[PDB]
Design a protein around this ligand. Structure first.
Ligand SMILES: *[C@@H]1O[C@H](CO[C@@H]2O[C@@H](C)[C@@H](O)[C@@H](O)[C@@H]2O)[C@@H](O[C@@H]2O[C@H](CO)[C@@H](O)[C@H](O)[C@H]2NC(C)=O)[C@H](O)[C@H]1NC(C)=O
Ligand SMILES: *[C@@H]1O[C@H](CO[C@@H]2O[C@@H](C)[C@@H](O)[C@@H](O)[C@@H]2O)[C@@H](O[C@@H]2O[C@H](CO)[C@@H](O)[C@H](O)[C@H]2NC(C)=O)[C@H](O)[C@H]1NC(C)=O
Ligand SMILES: *[C@@H]1O[C@H](CO[C@@H]2O[C@@H](C)[C@@H](O)[C@@H](O)[C@@H]2O)[C@@H](O)[C@H](O)[C@H]1NC(C)=O
Ligand SMILES: *[C@@H]1O[C@H](CO[C@@H]2O[C@@H](C)[C@@H](O)[C@@H](O)[C@@H]2O)[C@@H](O)[C@H](O)[C@H]1NC(C)=O
Ligand SMILES: *[C@@H]1O[C@H](CO[C@@H]2O[C@@H](C)[C@@H](O)[C@@H](O)[C@@H]2O)[C@@H](O)[C@H](O)[C@H]1NC(C)=O
Ligand SMILES: CNc1cccc2c(CN(C)CCC3CCCCCC3)c[nH]c12
Ligand SMILES: *[C@@H]1O[C@H](CO)[C@@H](O)[C@H](O)[C@H]1NC(C)=O
Length: 527
């Protein structure tokens, strides 16, 4: 029986057998008052002490969210859907600690992605037991509010100030600072890591003064706040809140009366109307996400980044070879996970309308012009691959590279990777390549489980990645120093070296997507 006295009371864990060893898991520790009733849309309130032994022996409720029903029964989509009951009572976190209890272990804190509208810490691919077992780090993950329940914003109004799900994350980091030493963890050695919206979240914790003392280092997988989907402007956020109000029958003149009306609505009424608060959405629509609230985020984050107003520390950033392909089968015409999705020029043009709905004609032709100068006009997958690259470069790769350039210009060590291995168990079709989200299982070390049908090459790739991530967390340097590995050089804004991650040859390259990102970073913002 493993009991730990936290500062709010004793929690009971459970023992896991992992790789002929043991990991102690505390699943579902509450870290905030449940944000129900008068607390919906507010910042998370601090938790009150209990005197019993809280049983942390099961993942807790996932936060309310809409579920992907686009491919019922398909593991490629349903593996991302919540695997615990949805509930507004969802402000819980998880801790995996090595057995025997470490003395001063480095802590990894996972922040999941999902477009700020979906996600949960209990997903199989976020299971921290392999990292704890193999690298003897402590892994922490938390649920945070998503959608309107996490990011509804009437900025300046404390009944719905915005960024609540970001403050959820923050309160959880605070929990680690106050409590993790009782678990054998070192609160002075905490590394945040996250993917997609989780990575965008990590990047905003680097920018938020209230988070600066709650962590040491940061890892950003396939995301950053300067991604075009990641921050909502004050204007859109207000228009979206008001539109939600009209759709629910909550239109009032007194802004507070609107929030109170929205507080007596059932979560499903709010979730159902979430998709229509914008006139033209895209498969990448983030209807309710981070905004400039003057609290978590004191200014437009592009300005903070450009002018060096962020935590000075090391970062590890990277992207996957085919970030954009996954979103093509959520709306682009002629695309399907069940055929090879050879699309025509006209379908490509139609696809640009789907992904760039409010962009001028000239802007859309400028995308076409820069992505359709063919090395071979007759290749039939030319247009199919261009659309994936357009979506992937615009939404993920170029913002991540731009974030890393700007961050490193202020003197900090930064390390950039390009993940280009397609999982041998990937249930999506081959034309979608190295998809968004499918490095996560390698980072969490699922291929180290021999029973799990991964190849031997994949076990070795995950082992090296797991070591690099742990070495970055512990020491600020993502090297694998023992097995004659390629040395990972720091990313500098002049030479922009990065490391490729694949089962064959791990290589040093320079200036990822140079031509494509000059278009997205220095042309397209002007259209
Ligand atoms: C700001 O919001 C208005 C209102 O949006 C409409 O009403 C909401 C309650 C919701 O149901 C939306 O889906 C509606 O579109 C937007 O105004 C609409 O704009 C479209 C196209 O521009 C037009 O066809 C509709 O008739 C407009 N509806 C109304 C009531 O004016 C407006 O576009 C939003 N602003 C931005 C920049 O997106
Ligand atoms: C690839 O599939 C898409 C999707 O169509 C559906 O899925 C198919 C696998 C099959 O089950 C079809 O019966 C379904 O309609 C095809 O896109 C459709 O194409 C037709 C004619 O080309 C068009 O009228 C529809 O509007 C398209 N629907 C969508 C959602 O785009 C596509 O043509 C297929 N391409 C190839 C190369 O096979
Ligand atoms: C908390 O857990 C106590 C310890 O029992 C352990 O957990 C239960 C769920 C069983 O799996 C048992 O075999 C374990 O040893 C329980 O006695 C207690 O009832 C639990 N408290 C609450 C409120 O559920
Ligand atoms: C735990 O270690 C503390 C020092 O932490 C050091 O600095 C941070 C930045 C990490 O990178 C970590 O690897 C370093 O060891 C001590 O100050 C503290 O007293 C120690 N406490 C215990 C109980 O061992
Ligand atoms: C390192 O490699 C181990 C197996 O490879 C063996 O060890 C190295 C040092 C060489 O001698 C090689 O020829 C041997 O076959 C793995 O078991 C281990 O997990 C690897 N470690 C990391 C961090 O990747
Ligand atoms: C930027 N992020 C993002 C934005 C908007 C929506 C989502 C979703 C939810 N739905 C709409 C798409 C799911 C796909 C994600 C990519 C991994 C394979 C599964 C398909 C996940 N991220 C999102
Ligand atoms: C809205 O009504 C509330 C009463 O709950 C009041 O406290 C607030 O000042 C009012 N705001 C405006 C703008 O009238």
């Amino acid at each position: 029986d493993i009991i730990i006295a936290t500062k709010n009371g004793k929690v009971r864990g459970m023992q896991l057998t992992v790789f002929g060893g043991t990991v102690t898991a505390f699943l579902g520790i509450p870290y905030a008052q449940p944000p129900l009733g008068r607390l919906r849309f507010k910042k998370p309130q601090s938790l009150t002490k209990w005197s019993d032994i809280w049983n942390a022996t099961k993942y807790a409720n996932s936060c309310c969210q809409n579920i992907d029903q686009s491919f019922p029964g398909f593991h490629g989509s349903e593996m991302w859907n919540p695997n615990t009951d949805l509930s507004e009572d969802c402000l819980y976190l998880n801790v995996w600690i090595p057995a025997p209890k470490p003395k001063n272990a480095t802590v990894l804190i996972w922040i999941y992605g999902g477009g700020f509208q979906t996600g949960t810490s209990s997903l199989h691919v976020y299971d921290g037991k392999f990292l704890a077992r193999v690298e003897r780090v402590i892994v922490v993950s938390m649920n945070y509010r998503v959608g309107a329940l996490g990011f509804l914003a009437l900025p300046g109004n404390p009944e719905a100030p915005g960024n609540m799900g970001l403050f959820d994350q923050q309160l959880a980091l605070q929990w680690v600072q106050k409590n993790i030493a009782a678990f054998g963890g070192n609160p002075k050695s905490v590394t945040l890591f996250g993917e997609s919206a989780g990575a965008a979240s990590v990047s905003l914790h680097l920018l938020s003064p209230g988070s600066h003392s709650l962590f040491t280092r940061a890892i950003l997988q396939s995301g950053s706040f300067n991604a075009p989907w990641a921050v909502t402007s004050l204007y859109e956020a207000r228009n979206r809140t008001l539109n939600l109000a009209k759709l629910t029958g909550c239109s009032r003149e007194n802004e507070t009366e609107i929030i109170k009306c929205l507080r007596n609505k059932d979560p499903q009424e709010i979730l159902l109307n979430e998709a229509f608060v914008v006139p033209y959405g895209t498969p990448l629509s983030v209807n309710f996400g981070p905004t400039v609230d003057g609290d978590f985020l004191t200014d437009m984050p592009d300005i903070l980044l450009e002018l060096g107003q962020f935590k000075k520390t090391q970062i590890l950033v990277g992207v996957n070879k085919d970030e954009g392909t996954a979103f093509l089968v959520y709306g682009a015409p002629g695309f399907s996970k069940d055929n090879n999705s050879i699309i025509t020029r006209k379908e490509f043009q139609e696809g640009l309308k789907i992904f760039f709905p409010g962009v001028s004609e000239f802007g859309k032709e400028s995308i076409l012009f820069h992505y359709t100068d063919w090395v071979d006009d007759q290749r039939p997958e030319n247009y199919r691959e261009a659309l994936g690259d357009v979506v992937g470069d615009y939404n993920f790769i170029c913002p991540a590279l731009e974030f890393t350039k700007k961050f490193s210009e202020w003197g900090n060590n930064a390390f950039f990777y390009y993940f280009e291995h397609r999982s041998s168990k990937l249930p999506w079709p081959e034309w979608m390549g190295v998809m968004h989200g499918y490095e996560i299982e390698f980072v969490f070390g699922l291929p180290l489980e021999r029973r799990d049908q991964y190849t031997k090459a994949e076990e070795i790739l995950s082992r090296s990645i797991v070591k690099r991530w742990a070495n970055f967390a512990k020491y600020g340097n993502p090297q694998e120093t023992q097995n004659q590995s390629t040395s990972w050089p720091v990313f500098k804004s002049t030479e922009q070296k990065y490391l490729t991650l694949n089962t064959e040859s791990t290589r040093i390259m320079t200036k990822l997507r140079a031509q494509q990102c000059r278009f997205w970073t220095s042309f397209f913002p002007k259209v």
